[PDB]
Structures are given as C-alpha cells and as structure tokens.
Amino acid sequence: ERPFVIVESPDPGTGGCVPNTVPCRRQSAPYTKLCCKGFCIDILKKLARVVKFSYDLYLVTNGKHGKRVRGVWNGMIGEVYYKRADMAIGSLTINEERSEIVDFSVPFVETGISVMVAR
Amino acid sequence: TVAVVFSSSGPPQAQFRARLTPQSFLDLPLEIQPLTVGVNTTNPSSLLTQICGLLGAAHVHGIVFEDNVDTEAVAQILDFISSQTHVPILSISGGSAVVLTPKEPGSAFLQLGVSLEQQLQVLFKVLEEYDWSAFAVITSLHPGHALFLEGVRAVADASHVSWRLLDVVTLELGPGGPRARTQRLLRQLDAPVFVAYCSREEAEVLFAEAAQAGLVGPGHVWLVPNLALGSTDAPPATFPVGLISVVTESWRLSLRQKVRDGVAILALGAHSYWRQHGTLPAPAGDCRVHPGPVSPAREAFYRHLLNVTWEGRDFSFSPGGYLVQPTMVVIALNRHRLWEMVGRWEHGVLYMKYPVWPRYSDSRHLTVATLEERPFVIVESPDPGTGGCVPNTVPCRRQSNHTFSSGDVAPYTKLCCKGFCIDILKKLARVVKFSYDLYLVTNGKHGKRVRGVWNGMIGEVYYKRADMAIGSLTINEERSEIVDFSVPFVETGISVMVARS
Amino acid sequence: KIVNIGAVLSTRKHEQMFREAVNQANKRHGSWKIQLNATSVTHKPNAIQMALSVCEDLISSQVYAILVSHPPTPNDHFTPTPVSYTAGFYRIPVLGLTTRMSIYSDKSIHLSFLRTVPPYSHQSSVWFEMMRVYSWNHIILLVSDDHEGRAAQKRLETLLEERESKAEKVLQFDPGTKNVTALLMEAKELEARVIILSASEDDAATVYRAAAMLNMTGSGYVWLVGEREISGNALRYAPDGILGLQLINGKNESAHISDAVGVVAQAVHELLEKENITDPPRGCVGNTNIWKTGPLFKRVLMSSKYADGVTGRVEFNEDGDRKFANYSIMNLQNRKLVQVGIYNGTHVIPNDRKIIWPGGETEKPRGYQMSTRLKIVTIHQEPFVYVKPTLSDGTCKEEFTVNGDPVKKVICTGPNDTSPGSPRHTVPQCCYGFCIDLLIKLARTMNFTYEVHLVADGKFGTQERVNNSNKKEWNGMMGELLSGQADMIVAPLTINNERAQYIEFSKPFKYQGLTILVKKRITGINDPRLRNPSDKFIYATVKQSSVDIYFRRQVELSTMYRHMEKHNYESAAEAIQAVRDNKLHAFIWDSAVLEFEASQKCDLVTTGELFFRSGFGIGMRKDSPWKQNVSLSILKSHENGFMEDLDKTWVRYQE
Ligand SMILES: COC(=O)c1ccc([C@H]2C(C(C)=O)=C(O)C(=O)N2CCc2c(C)[nH]c3ccccc23)cc1
Ligand SMILES: *[C@@H]1O[C@H](CO)[C@@H](O[C@@H]2O[C@H](CO)[C@@H](O)[C@H](O)[C@H]2NC(C)=O)[C@H](O)[C@H]1NC(C)=O
Numbered sequence A: 001e002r003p004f005v006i007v008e009s010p011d012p013g014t015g016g017c018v019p020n021t022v023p024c025r026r027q028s029a030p031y032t033k034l035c036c037k038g039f040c041i042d043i044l045k046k047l048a049r050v051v052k053f054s055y056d057l058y059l060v061t062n063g064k065h066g067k068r069v070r071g072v073w074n075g076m077i078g079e080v081y082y083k084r085a086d087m088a089i090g091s092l093t094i095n096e097e098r099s100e101i102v103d104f105s106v107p108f109v110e111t112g113i114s115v116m117v118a119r
Numbered sequence B: 001t002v003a004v005v006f007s008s009s010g011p012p013q014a015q016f017r018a019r020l021t022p023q024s025f026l027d028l029p030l031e032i033q034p035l036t037v038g039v040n041t042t043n044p045s046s047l048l049t050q051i052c053g054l055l056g057a058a059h060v061h062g063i064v065f066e067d068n069v070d071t072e073a074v075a076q077i078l079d080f081i082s083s084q085t086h087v088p089i090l091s092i093s094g095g096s097a098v099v100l101t102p103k104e105p106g107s108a109f110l111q112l113g114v115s116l117e118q119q120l121q122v123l124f125k126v127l128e129e130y131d132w133s134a135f136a137v138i139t140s141l142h143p144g145h146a147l148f149l150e151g152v153r154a155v156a157d158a159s160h161v162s163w164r165l166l167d168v169v170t171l172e173l174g175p176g177g178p179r180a181r182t183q184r185l186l187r188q189l190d191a192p193v194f195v196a197y198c199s200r201e202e203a204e205v206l207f208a209e210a211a212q213a214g215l216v217g218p219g220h221v222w223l224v225p226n227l228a229l230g231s232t233d234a235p236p237a238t239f240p241v242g243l244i245s246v247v248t249e250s251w252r253l254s255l256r257q258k259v260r261d262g263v264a265i266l267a268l269g270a271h272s273y274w275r276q277h278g279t280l281p282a283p284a285g286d287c288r289v290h291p292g293p294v295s296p297a298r299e300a301f302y303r304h305l306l307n308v309t310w311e312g313r314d315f316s317f318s319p320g321g322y323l324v325q326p327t328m329v330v331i332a333l334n335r336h337r338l339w340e341m342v343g344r345w346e347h348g349v350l351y352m353k354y355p356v357w358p359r360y361s362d363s364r365h366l367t368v369a370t371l372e373e374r375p376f377v378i379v380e381s382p383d384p385g386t387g388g389c390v391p392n393t394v395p396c397r398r399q400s401n402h403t404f405s406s407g408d409v410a411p412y413t414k415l416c417c418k419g420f421c422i423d424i425l426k427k428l429a430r431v432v433k434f435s436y437d438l439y440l441v442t443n444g445k446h447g448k449r450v451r452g453v454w455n456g457m458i459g460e461v462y463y464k465r466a467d468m469a470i471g472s473l474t475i476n477e478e479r480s481e482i483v484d485f486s487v488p489f490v491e492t493g494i495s496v497m498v499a500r501s
Numbered sequence C: 001k002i003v004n005i006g007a008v009l010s011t012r013k014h015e016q017m018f019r020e021a022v023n024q025a026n027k028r029h030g031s032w033k034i035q036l037n038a039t040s041v042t043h044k045p046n047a048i049q050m051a052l053s054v055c056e057d058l059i060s061s062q063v064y065a066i067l068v069s070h071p072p073t074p075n076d077h078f079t080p081t082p083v084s085y086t087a088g089f090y091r092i093p094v095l096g097l098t099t100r101m102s103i104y105s106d107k108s109i110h111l112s113f114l115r116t117v118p119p120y121s122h123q124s125s126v127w128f129e130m131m132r133v134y135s136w137n138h139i140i141l142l143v144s145d146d147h148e149g150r151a152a153q154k155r156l157e158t159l160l161e162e163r164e165s166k167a168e169k170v171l172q173f174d175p176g177t178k179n180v181t182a183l184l185m186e187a188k189e190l191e192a193r194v195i196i197l198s199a200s201e202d203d204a205a206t207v208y209r210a211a212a213m214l215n216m217t218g219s220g221y222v223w224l225v226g227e228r229e230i231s232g233n234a235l236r237y238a239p240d241g242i243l244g245l246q247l248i249n250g251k252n253e254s255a256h257i258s259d260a261v262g263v264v265a266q267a268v269h270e271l272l273e274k275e276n277i278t279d280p281p282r283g284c285v286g287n288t289n290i291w292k293t294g295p296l297f298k299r300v301l302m303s304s305k306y307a308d309g310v311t312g313r314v315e316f317n318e319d320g321d322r323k324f325a326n327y328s329i330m331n332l333q334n335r336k337l338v339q340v341g342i343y344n345g346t347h348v349i350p351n352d353r354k355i356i357w358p359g360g361e362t363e364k365p366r367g368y369q370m371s372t373r374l375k376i377v378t379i380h381q382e383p384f385v386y387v388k389p390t391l392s393d394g395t396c397k398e399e400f401t402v403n404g405d406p407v408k409k410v411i412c413t414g415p416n417d418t419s420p421g422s423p424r425h426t427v428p429q430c431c432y433g434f435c436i437d438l439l440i441k442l443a444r445t446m447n448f449t450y451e452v453h454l455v456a457d458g459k460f461g462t463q464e465r466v467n468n469s470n471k472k473e474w475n476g477m478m479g480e481l482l483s484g485q486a487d488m489i490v491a492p493l494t495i496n497n498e499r500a501q502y503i504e505f506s507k508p509f510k511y512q513g514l515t516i517l518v519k520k521r522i523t524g525i526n527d528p529r530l531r532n533p534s535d536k537f538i539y540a541t542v543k544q545s546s547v548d549i550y551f552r553r554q555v556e557l558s559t560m561y562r563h564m565e566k567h568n569y570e571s572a573a574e575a576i577q578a579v580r581d582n583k584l585h586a587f588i589w590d591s592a593v594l595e596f597e598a599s600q601k602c603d604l605v606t607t608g609e610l611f612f613r614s615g616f617g618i619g620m621r622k623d624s625p626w627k628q629n630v631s632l633s634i635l636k637s638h639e640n641g642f643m644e645d646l647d648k649t650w651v652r653y654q655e
C-alpha cells in the first residue's frame, strides 16, 4: 500500500539493499529477495529496537486484506488466524467482525470512510 | 553472673589479668559476678565442651564471645547452641559479628553489626553528595550475593536521582588457576565509579588484576562495603589509594572497651527488669537433658533486653538480631595507608570533612573554569531545603581563597550553574567521556597581563592550575600564542549599540 | 587408593543396604585405582551429643562425604542441622536422602549441602503449569508466616511477575493460630474464586474447619493444596474434590541411597585425576583450618550427571535441588484419594479417569464469578456529564427536546455541593448528557445494573509521591479505581502511558487533541512570549491533570512548566470564566471541551488547531474479564452510526 508499504527491487549496486530498508520476499520454493520501505516498516524497526525481538517479513499472495467466503479467510487476517504468522502490520483497519478472531493493539493512525469528488 | 569467652588473639595476658575482680565495670547498676573462660585453637568440639561445662558449673546468666577476624562459619554454631540452651548470647567482636538473616526460631543472639541494606543506603548517600550518577557493579561469586545484587537496585530505586547505571558483572576469582575469563570481562568495562562485592581473601585478586587493566588511576574511585578490609589495623598492599568504605561506630575502640560495653548492656537490661521488681531469671539446666520445650514467662527478659541505651548511644536491636539506626562513619585510605574518618551519619544527615574529593596520588577527570556572563553561564543559589540543585544544573563551588598566608579556609558555598556553555560542557562530557568540576575564578574577568603576569581564565590555564576553560572567551593573536584554542562554536565580533531611534 | 566415604542413618537395617550399595558400586570400579570403604552412625535423642558423635565419626576416617537420613523422630526440621553445621565448618560435602525444609537451600547459611529430593518450594512451578493448562487467571494465595511459606510465595510471585500478571490478593496468617474467620472473610469478598493453600497439617485442619463453617467450600470454587496439607489429621475432614500432588517415590529412604552412592562414586572418580590432592581433614580438634579442595569437590559433584537411576536421571540445580523429579496429581473422590495424572514438572499428561470438582459438576469451573451490581465513578465535565439538582417530588424536572423523545437522566450522589467549605455532607443529585447515554446503551447491551456516584476531590487523577515516603498512590478518580472504591469509569478519561501502566482501557470512542481558547499576537507553542515568562500573556491549566504530566515530561521546557507551577486553577468552567473576566489570557485543554463552548455561547475562539492528539476511553481494573465485550460493543456502536446520531444530538446542535 503506497503510503505505508513500498516494495523495491534491489539495485545492481552491491547486491544488498539500500540502508534504512528491510529485506522482504513475496512467498508463494524459489524466491526473489525484494526489499520493503515505508511507514509501518519504520514502526516495525522501532518496535524491534525497543521490545528486543527479531523478525522476518514476507508479503502475502491471496486477496489483499481479508474476507470470509464461508470460513475461507484469505489475506493477512487469514494468515494470522490459521497460525502461520504471529503479527500482520500495515493498512489493516479495525471492525467488529475481524476483532472476533484476531486480537488488536492500540491504534496509531486513525481512518474512516470518505468521499472524493471532482473539483 | 556473666561469662567471657576469649576465642583468639595475640598475647592474651592483658585481658586475662584484667578479668580478676568485679571492680572493672563498677558502674553497672547491679552486683556483677564475672567469670572468665579461655579457649585454645577453635573448633566445634572445643566450643561445645567449654560452654556446656561453664553452663553446667556456674549458673551463667549470659555469655559474651570475642573472636578473631576472617572466620566464616562460627556464628551459626553459636546460634545453634543458644537455641538448644535458650540462654542469651552476645558477640561483640570482629569475626562472628556478621549478620545472618534467617535464625533459628527460639534463639537469642543479639549480634552487634549492620546488614547490607544500611551500608548500601549510606554508600548511596555519599555517592549522591558528589554529583556522582554513573557507576559499574562488579561482584564475585561469593555466596549471599543475590541479596546484595537486589538491595543495590532496590535502594537505587528508592532515591529520587536518576541513577543511570552502566553495567553489572559477576566474576569468578579465587586461586590463580581460573583467572582468564575475568580478565577479559574486566578489560571491556569502563565507568567513573565502581561498587564491588567480594571478601578479603578475594580483593587481593580483584585489585591486582584491576591494576593491570588501567583501573586504579586517580580518574576512577572505588566503594566497597565492610565485609572486606577485615583487618582494619594493618591494611595490605595492592589496594588502591583512597577507596571509600563504611564502618559502624566504635571501630577504634579497645578490646577492653568492647567487653565493658557488652557487660554494660547485659547488666543494664538486667537492672532494667529489676526496677520492675519481678525477678532475676535463672538460665536453663545443662546440655545433657535437651531441655526447654516451650518458652515460659522468661520471654519478657529477652524483650526487655532490646531498647536499653547506655552513655547516650542508641542500641535499639531489631527483631532480626541486628541493631537498628546506629551511628556509622565513612573511612578511606589516605596517602599513608592508614584509614581515617571522613564523615558521621548522626540522625540521618551526612557530614563530610572534605568539601571536594581530593583525588590524591593517561588520565581523566579534568578541571574546568568559568565565570558569570549573562546568557552563557548563570550562577544562582541552591535549593531552599535540599541543597541538591535542580535537575539539569551543575554544582559549581567557587574558590574564594583570597588569602591563605594568614587565613584558615574560605567557606565554599555550594552554588549551581546553568546555561549555554554548561550545556555544551554536558554534551562534551557525554561524548568524549570525561569528568569535570567547575570552579569560578576570582582574579580578573578574562585576562590582561599586568606587566608580565596574566589573570583570570587565561591566567589559570597558563599556570597549569586548570586543564580546560569554558565560557565567554574571545580568540585573538595576543593570547593564542600562550594557550591552545578550539574551533569556534559561537560567532562574535565588535558592535556599537546606539540609544534609540 | 583407599577412598573413604561416610553416612548417617537410623535404621540399623538399611545400613546393611548402604554397605551393599557401596560394595556393588565398588564392583563397577575395583582395580584398586580407587577403593571404597563405608562407615555409619545412628541418631540420638540429644542434639549436642549428636554433633559430637558426627565429629568423632569424621575423625574416625579420612571422610569424603556424609549421607544423612530422617529417623523415626517427628521433629523433621532440625534433625539434619547438627551434622550440617559441624561438617560445614570444614566444607565437607553432605547429601540429604530425604528432607524437605526450604532453609537448607540458603547457601550463605549452610555452606556445603546438597539434596536428592525437591524442596516444598518447587510445587509453585507445578501450580503455575496447572494454571496455564486450565486457564485460571484470577488467583488468591493464602500462606503462613514461617520461612517456608514466604519462600513459596516468593517463587510463585517471581514466576507471575516474569509473565507480568501479579496476584489478585495475597493474605497471610501467623502460624499456630485458631479462630481466624477474619482472613477468610476478607478473601471472600472478591470476584476471584480459586485459593491456594500451604501450611502445616494442624493449620490446614483449622482452615478447613473455618472455611466449611463459612460455606466457602461448596460449588463454584476450586482450591488446590500442596502435599503437606493432605496428610495426618488434616486429611481427616476436608471438602471433597481438593486437588493435590505427591512425590514420585519419596519416603522410600532406600531408593535414593543407591543414587547417592552412585553419584558420589562418579564424582570421586573424576576428582582424583586432578593435581590438587589435598587429602580431606583428619581430626576434630586442633585443626582450625579448612579442606583445601572442598569447593572444587562440591563444584565437580554438582555438575556430575547419572545415566540410569532407580528414580530417574539425576541432575542438580544451582543449589542442589533434585532437578526434574516426577509428580503425581491427586484428588478426593468421596473420602478416598486417587491418581489422576502424572506431571514431570515441565508438562502435565492426564493419564487417568475424569476429575470431579467440589460442587459435584463435571464441566470445568471458571474463576471470576462475575458480579452484577457495579459501582461507577465520573467527574463533572460540561459537554459530557451535566450535573443538576433534583426537585422536591424526588425526580429532577423532565426536559423534552426537539427530536420528540426525552433526555435520559440518572441519580448521582457523593459530593458536598460546596467544595471550599463543607464540614461533612453528601447530597443526591441528577446527572445526564453524553457519557450517561453511552452508559445507558452499554448497560442495556450487556445485562448489568449501575449505581453512579461522584468523586471526592474533583480532580481527574494524577500520580504523585507525597513527602516522607517512597510509595506513590494515585489521587482522585484515578485512585478510586485502584484502591477498590469503583469498578468502572464512564468519563472523558484520556489514555496515557502512565495510566496504562496500572489500569487497562477499552478501544477509543472519541478522538481529539489539545488546543487553545482565546477571548475574541497569540498562536501555537513556539513563540518567545510563551517560551519565556512575561506579564503581557499568562497561560495556565487545571492542576493535578494530564497536561501537568505532559509539561513535566520534558526537560527542555522546564522554565515554561515552572511558570505553570507558579499559579494554576484546581477548577472547571470556572477557568473559562477566569478567562472571561480578562484575568487569564489564554487556555490550553482538550479539543472537544473547548470546541463545544466556543461555538456554543459566544465571543470566544479556538487558536489554530491541535498539536498533540489522543483519544477517550473507558477505564477498567487490570485484566478484568469485561474489557473484550466492552470493546466489541464500542466497535459495534461505531459501525452502526449510533455514535453518529448521538454525536449530532449533543455536539452538532450548536452554531
Ligand atoms: C564521576 O562521574 C560523573 O560525575 C559523571 C560523569 C559523566 C556523566 C555522564 C554525563 C553527563 C550528563 O554529565 C552523561 O550524559 C554521560 O554520558 N556521562 C558519562 C558517561 C560515561 C561513559 C559511558 N563512560 C565514561 C567514562 C568516564 C566518565 C564518564 C563516562 C555522569 C557523571
Ligand atoms: C522496651 O520494649 C518493651 C516491649 O518489648 C516495652 O514494654 C514492656 O513489655 C512487656 C511485655 O512482657 C511488659 O510486661 C512491660 O510492662 C512493658 N514495659 C514495662 C517496662 O512495663 C518496654 O516498655 C520498652 N522500654 C522502653 C525503654 O520504653
């Protein structure tokens, strides 16, 4: 999601990615190591620096955020509900139906619904 | 009737002859019937046999035990014996006067000594006096160290000052076989202040290894509790010059004075009950019966043996068998290798003999100079009641020694400086890792030599009375030939302010 | 070489087993490289002579260790002390075949001492594992004053604080006591109903009598005790279904002897290949010295493991604890004990029948019997909580609105109606507005009954440490929740880190920030007129509030805060009037409070916009079982549009 999570292919300079970026992979066995940069990624770096833990970050393949097609939850919500991950950071809002099966921390960016029109 | 049990000493003739008649301690408000006991080289069999025989023979109403220092597992035997006989004990000595936290339920020990909590509180009081706010902790694997490791943190929490600590290290140092890992661990830790915990048989290894890794110079300073330095009479070699410790009162008293104090406290308790006209309770029978199943109305006696004072000295004994709220002094090693008093702790206020720590004798701890310049450095008055100035403000005791040829001492009132240059000094201290102490100058403003002799800030720097100098100081070619300047951090010049428009 | 070890027992029959064990262990290695002997003594009714006899036993040979066991005497505490102290003088390692008191682990007092059976303190790990399994979070801990109880409580608290959860309530009674209904009464009046017991047998029986008298042993409760509390006269009368636990095969006294001799041999074999053959002390008199390699022998003995022990693999803790002994779960199935599962201290494996509980039910009980009568505390804030006096008929006057439906109201008590001068007076009033309507909806949504009241001071609540003390207690409304005065807070309470340390909130239901009110140059907090003190402009806030903390939480703003320390109001809309009377130049406070009054009355303007943004949230006590449902109701309200309809009603009906 462009304002918050940005994916960049590693440059041909020296193999490794530009500093202040984190190695990330879009899983699906063969892999190509992109690197991710953004807002929630900076939040994650600070969290790893304060809570004294280590992480590996991997992108999702299926539907973007979440849904329930008769219990088949795709997206990050699904990846957390089926015990294949421990967190899911990014553009993930809060609503009653999600918080039933997945916990949540305090909010850090407040959103809602809005209408954009022509000037 | 009381007993005296000498455990170990040099020539014993003095006290043995002194124990002849009850004219000694002829000021206790009761009739004293003393009896002496001698003891050879000490071991459990000897102690058990001797005191059991004395109890069975003399109807002894109390015992005092004076022992040699550096013994580790003597007091517990006394506790077990006193529990099994229920007759009181009191050890006014060096070896057995080290506190045990858990005792046996029915005993009556009355140790005369302080715990780690009180010593640590006094150590932190003296630590906070001199602005010292960073330190490292090094503790040997001597048992009963977790208690110290947690008391340090508890007391540090209790106080208001930030108390930002660098690192804590647990060494394992003994005979010189396993003495390599501790070397690396001690190599890579740096701090201005150290608080260490080890025994006397281990400081000779700790300080010996510390002197090899550059940790004994006048830049650093040490503080250790009273568990070490057991032989206060003759301090050993390889100890640092000027390490700070705390000792209970009567560290200079004589052995005769100590036994006098013991018999005095016992007789004072006895006569304190006598004023109640109840009784003079007799001790238990002997050792061969294993008697004393329960505690009779005798339990008052032990209780009445607590609050009793003597000669204006509070001797309040806690339910834990150690005296609470005594007076204790701070000692250090001068440049003569003999301890000297520094400051008492009467009624919970620190006194100090030195307004500034001497730092006697690469290096650290360089001195600085500054004077009032209205935005750059501001000098004011300390707290109305505390004396420890506001957070983010540096104590700065000005030197007003205008005369020393026929003047004793000028009272260095504790002022505290704050401002811009002091902020830069704080940042420099954090970055380049040094230590400082400001002191205002009282010979001229900045400097203008009066026919060959300088004055002020540049004068102090030139005559090597100060390593650095910060404040409102201008760069020229007149004085830049004599001292060395830094790259400028404030742009200045000459300006002409006019009246109005 | 002739290697000699010793032992002390009381059987005169199992001593033959000891010599058989040492000979059989000598069959494992007997090439004379090392050779083993064996000595023994018996116990005596007198302690001093017992110590002297251990002394003479020690002198008898060049002894390398001591093995001590529990005689038929009933004084199980002091029995191994006379052997431990005496030998402790010379640092002669000893082992305890069977002893459970938790004083022998204090390595600063018994210098050299080991064990082959876990102490009574280690049961706390089993209790913690059972709690993790059955998911009982609210626990009550009832303990004694003797050292063993304090040690067990300290270990359990170490675990719980390691998970940062703490205990609901800890309460202790001094040992050797009777007629103590007061403490059970004090523990009865809380929501947590699981209680954990550890005391002597007679005290266990007395507690059982009192609790059975107090009805607190029936259904709805689960309390699990240790092993010392289901033996002897205590086991006689007890409520059915008490969980317990027993040792693997303890009190055999002959199973541990083989392991002791085996580990002693394994250690002495490794010791003898070292350069320092000091040779153990010989003599109980004259020798005022120590063994030159006692600590080294203890260290090698500690870190020496065993292959196949009758009681399992043997390792030692940092102090000589048994290190992974087995444990057997128990029960009380109608006056007869039974095995229900085996736990190895790491995990519990239920390998037996079903477990019945005190009430006779079969489904697993849950703690926290949820109450239904909840207290509520709130504060006077204009846009949210209006306070008014009631009429003489007993009801505050009705007030219809343009919508066609009336305004909800409730009865709120508590204040003196006159803060400055009031000797003693509490009066009933009426409360209404935004938060009261939100409480109405919440209560009707989750089936409960409320009794609202007001605070006793008027301040929001802010942590502070009074002089001459080291503890800091919260003041005002924030304190009222912690000390037990209230159960919930329906009021405009902001959510800061310091508050979140000790209480826990729901999800936010209204977002806002901090802003400035001015009577119609003034701007945000950057101007030198503000950063520096001057008489032209004066700024202030409300004392004992969140903004006070926010301005004391920044070193680089010290002077400004100092300005605030000079004079500020402990007040309300009174501060708005102080601004109105031209006394105060500007006001800095929450966004909604200022924005309502500015567009509401007249002639007042808000300066710029927000700079520090935060939310409003309900406050609840730590880990209370209501938070999840409250948050699920708040999110549902946000999704419905009800907070939208509610919002216009009370704040959009202006301008
Ligand atoms: C006698 O000791 C002191 O009085 C003293 C000296 C320096 C500081 C502070 C300093 C400030 C605010 O003044 C800090 O911000 C800071 O980083 N300090 C020192 C840090 C430091 C390190 C890491 N290593 C050292 C070695 C020697 C001396 C200091 C250090 C604190 C106290
Ligand atoms: C010293 O402390 C004791 C308490 O341990 C004080 O109280 C005495 O307590 C016993 C209990 O058996 C009473 O029977 C006595 O009557 C109490 N006092 C007296 C002397 O009657 C005792 O008062 C304290 N003494 C001081 C110095 O205040």
Ligand SMILES: *[C@@H]1O[C@H](CO)[C@@H](O[C@@H]2O[C@H](CO)[C@@H](O)[C@H](O)[C@H]2NC(C)=O)[C@H](O)[C@H]1NC(C)=O
Residues within 6 Å of the ligand: C037, C038, C039, C040, C060, C061
């Ligand atoms: C090996 O052990 C035996 C017994 O455990 C020792 O023999 C004992 O010696 C003491 C000496 O005071 C006697 O009082 C006992 O009666 C003896 N018991 C037996 C069964 O003979 C023997 O001394 C030990 N070996 C060595 C070399 O000392």
Ligand SMILES: *[C@@H]1O[C@H](CO)[C@@H](O)[C@H](O)[C@H]1NC(C)=O
Residues within 6 Å of the ligand: C249, C252, C254, C255, C310
């Ligand atoms: C002790 O352990 C042995 C070996 O497991 C066993 O045979 C015996 O029944 C147990 N109990 C007693 C009292 O010996």
Ligand SMILES: *[C@@H]1O[C@H](CO)[C@@H](O)[C@H](O)[C@H]1NC(C)=O
Residues within 6 Å of the ligand: C370, C625, C626, C629
């Ligand atoms: C929480 O709500 C659920 C239904 O949403 C209900 O089953 C449960 O009993 C509630 N818990 C409490 C403690 O009220």
